[PDB]
Amino acid sequence: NLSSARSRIQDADYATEVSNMSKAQILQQAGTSVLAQANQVPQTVLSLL
């Protein structure tokens, strides 16, 4: 019973951890892409001269 008590507070719920990791990876790829496009935001300024 005490081992179950420890599991209820200490062991990680794999089902939610996998989903959290997946969403984190998705956010990472999206962030890298949007950061790139933000880096080409000032490029349009380098058209008129």
Q: Which residues bind other proteins (CB under 8 A)?
A: 6, 9-21, 23-28, 30-32, 34-35, 38-39, 41-42, 45-46
CA–chain centroid gap for 10, Å, is 23
Which helix (H) or strand (E) element contains residue 21?
A: helix 14-39
In this structure, which amino acid lies at residue 40?
A: Q
| Shortest spacing between CB 3 and other proteins, in angstroms | 11
| Shortest spacing between CB 37 and other proteins, in angstroms | 9
Neighbours of 1 (CB within 10 A): 5
| Shortest spacing between CB 42 and other proteins, in angstroms | 4
